[PDB]
């Protein structure tokens, strides 16, 4: 059972700079027939994998010369020169010399200047309330870096339980991320409190961004 | 080019299902074919492959012969029969063309969910500014898609004609049902004067919900 170990797990790089990704195999990938069946694939956000490099160093049709694969035996490298934003995604190595297996992937992240989130809050819709549910939503849009914390307060008190946080992958259009934070309550609990607040801590600011509403004005 | 997988969807544990994949644009019996699957958290796993005429196949050993890969050369179709499914078979399955040991064409992928739970359509709720908030030069609207099973849904805005400023957030499971959301931003002068509607398609329940956003 041949293990493919990729290094690093995530790689941040500036546009125009070079990225280098390592793939090691636990057994030599030189087949008895002399070929080395070591290949590289790229999976962009929301897409299927696509072939980038086959048999160590061969660029697939449509892949620019910026992408270069090298190595031998058990040690392989993918180098991407002059990184462009659309290069971002997960790079996987694969071997098919033996029973075929895949590396765990390396996520290429594009560096940009720190950008603050645009934060929006929404109360539960009357449609949802009509059904006994109450979700409060905060969208945090177009921020960088990806690390960000959202804290919900109900009548001033933090509520940890019932929160679903979901990040997008990185957008190649502007190298930013967005995330959705949803606090789901029952209508019963929702109607017993008035103040609903989402606070975003991100470091593009010293003080958290706060967005809030009062249920009675809604 | 192109490989297109059949709809996957929900299957009860212990039950069986068959995926198909339709190939266009090449001499089908001139290429080996393969199936690969991807789980979140995570990793790709080779499932099976088949030679030109179908006389020789390879299978991931741990499948214990429960899966059968086959091809109809007269119809340009690749099949994966899957028997006695367990939760561990839940994944996105990709059809792929195999050449000299590498996969040089991949399908879009189709998800298969092995669960005893019932198919449930999405509830789709509007997300609009409320509560006496003021409004600037733009407005961010959204849709909250809650309570559905299995994955996946697709959300579009104005039948796809609004696309530039859209964010779609990955689904999360909670209490055995999925929740996801989508946001779009438009200039304030243009809403509500020029309507904005989110369309949510959920193949597993054969349902589409087209929710109009109101102030």
């Amino acid at each position: 059972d041949v293990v493919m170990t990729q290094t690093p797990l995530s790689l941040p790089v500036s546009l125009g700079d070079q990225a280098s990704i390592s793939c090691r195999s636990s057994q030599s990938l030189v087949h008895s027939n002399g070929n080395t069946y070591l290949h590289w694939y790229l999976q962009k956000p929301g897409q299927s994998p696509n072939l980038l490099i086959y048999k160590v160093s061969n660029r697939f049709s449509g892949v620019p010369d910026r992408f270069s694969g090298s190595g031998s035996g058990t040690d392989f490298t993918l180098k991407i020169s002059r990184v462009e934003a659309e290069d971002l995604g997960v790079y996987f190595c694969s071997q098919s010399t033996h029973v075929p297996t895949f590396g765990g992937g390396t996520k290429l992240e594009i560096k940009r200047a720190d950008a603050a989130p645009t934060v929006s809050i929404f109360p539960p819709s009357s449609e949802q309330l009509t059904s006994g549910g109450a979700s409060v939503v905060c969208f945090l849009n177009n921020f960088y870096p990806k690390d960000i914390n959202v804290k919900w307060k109900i009548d001033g008190s933090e509520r940890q339980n019932g929160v679903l946080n979901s990040w997008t992958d990185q957008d190649s259009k502007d190298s930013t991320y967005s995330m959705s934070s949803t606090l789901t309550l029952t209508k019963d609990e929702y109607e017993r409190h008035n103040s609903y607040t989402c606070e975003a801590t991100h470091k593009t600011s010293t003080s958290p961004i706060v967005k809030s509403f009062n249920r009675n004005e809604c | 080019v192109k490989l297109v997988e059949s709809e996957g969807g929900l299957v009860q544990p212990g039950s069986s299902m068959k995926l198909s994949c339709t190939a266009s644009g090449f001499t089908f019996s001139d290429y080996y074919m393969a199936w690969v699957r991807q789980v979140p958290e995570k990793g790709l796993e080779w499932v099976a492959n088949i030679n030109y005429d179908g006389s020789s196949t390879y299978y991931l050993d741990s499948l214990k012969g429960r899966f059968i890969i086959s091809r109809d050369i007269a119809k340009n179709i690749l099949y994966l029969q899957m028997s006695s499914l367990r939760c561990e078979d839940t994944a996105t399955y990709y059809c792929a063309r195999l050449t000299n040991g590498y996969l040089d064409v991949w399908g879009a992928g189709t998800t298969v969910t092995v669960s005893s739970a019932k198919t449930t359509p999405p509830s789709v709720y509007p997300l609009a500014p409320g509560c006496g908030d003021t409004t600037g030069s733009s407005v961010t609207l959204g849709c909250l898609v809650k309570g559905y099973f299995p994955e996946s849904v697709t959300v579009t805005w104005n039948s796809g004609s609004l696309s530039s400023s859209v964010h779609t957030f990955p689904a999360l499971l909670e209490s055995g049902l999925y929740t996801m959301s989508s946001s779009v931003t438009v200039p304030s002068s243009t809403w509500p004067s020029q309507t904005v509607t989110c369309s949510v398609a959920h193949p597993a329940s054969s349902t589409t919900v087209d929710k109009k956003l109101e102030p």
């Binding site: 069946y37 098919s96 | 040991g101």
Partner: peptide, 8 residues
């Protein structure tokens, strides 16, 4: 010319 080398 294998196609599926490990099968060899």
């Amino acid at each position: 010319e294998p196609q599926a080398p490990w099968m060899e």
